[PDB]
């Protein structure tokens, strides 16, 4: 799928993106990103021979902060992209009733399907 109003330049978060619900505090995806940041600081201790779980606690706090921040912005952009996809889908549904006909519900009193037994 393509832009869809790249006219209207790049615009990392549009001004229409302040109508969607934001990602809340302690949402599990950014909790996973914080766990990944903790593991990143831990392997950062592990590359050089500095000891694990200690003597790098400011780096742990730094990597947690930075990754949770970046993941928060990307979660907001992700929610906006799914919202604009759903609204464009429903707009093209409502725009042309001629090509998407309503399937009248043939209930199972009259729908015929064969049997083909497994013995």
């Amino acid at each position: 799928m393509t832009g869809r109003q790249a006219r209207a330049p790049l615009q990392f978060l549009p001004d229409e993106a302040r109508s969607l619900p934001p990602p809340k505090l302690t949402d599990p995806r950014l909790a996973y990103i914080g766990f990944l940041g903790y593991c990143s600081g831990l392997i950062d201790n592990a590359i050089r021979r500095r000891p694990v779980l200690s003597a790098g606690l400011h780096r742990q706090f730094l990597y947690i902060t930075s990754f949770v921040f970046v993941g928060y912005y990307l979660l907001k952009r992700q929610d906006y992209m799914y919202a604009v996809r759903d609204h464009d889908m429903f707009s093209y549904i409502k725009s042309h009733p001629e090509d998407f006909p309503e399937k009248d519900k043939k209930t199972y009193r009259e729908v015929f399907e064969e049997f083909h037994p497994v013995r």
């Binding site: 109003q5 229409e16 109508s19 969607l20 619900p21 929610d79 799914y82 919202a83 604009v84 996809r85 759903d86 609204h87 464009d88 889908m89 429903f90 707009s91 725009s95």
Partner: protein, 171 residues
Amino acid sequence: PGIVELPSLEDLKVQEVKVSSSVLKAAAHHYGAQCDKPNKEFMLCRWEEKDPRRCLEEGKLVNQCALEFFRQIKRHCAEPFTEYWTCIDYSGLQLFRRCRKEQAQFDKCVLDKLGWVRPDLGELSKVTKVKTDRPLPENPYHSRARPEPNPEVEGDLKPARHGSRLFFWTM
């Protein structure tokens, strides 16, 4: 497809001003003064319709105006107008600073005997109004209509419908 609509040979007979080039170049400024008032009709016709085979009556009009002007300068002073343009003729491309004293002589002739102040610089410029009799044309670029407009997508956006709607990672 479509054929052109050429004018006839009956409109293609104006008394052509079969004069030479240096005399026509030296006789330019006072021709801009006395005549060249009703040929901006022709200029506005040419720039409101990009179509000669249509503005040719005004071409016949500027042709007869220039011939009338050269008749009027032919009958009266100067006959040393001939001396002035043959003084300016053989000087390569005709610089007007070449034969300046005889330019003053021709100006003094035409001023003291006929009138016709020379247009000072820069008065052969300075964008000029013109009224006509014909009404101004519409859409001379003969084209069709602008075929389809894009329906402009507006309206305040809903949130996502049941998440990504991919395989999984719902919400």
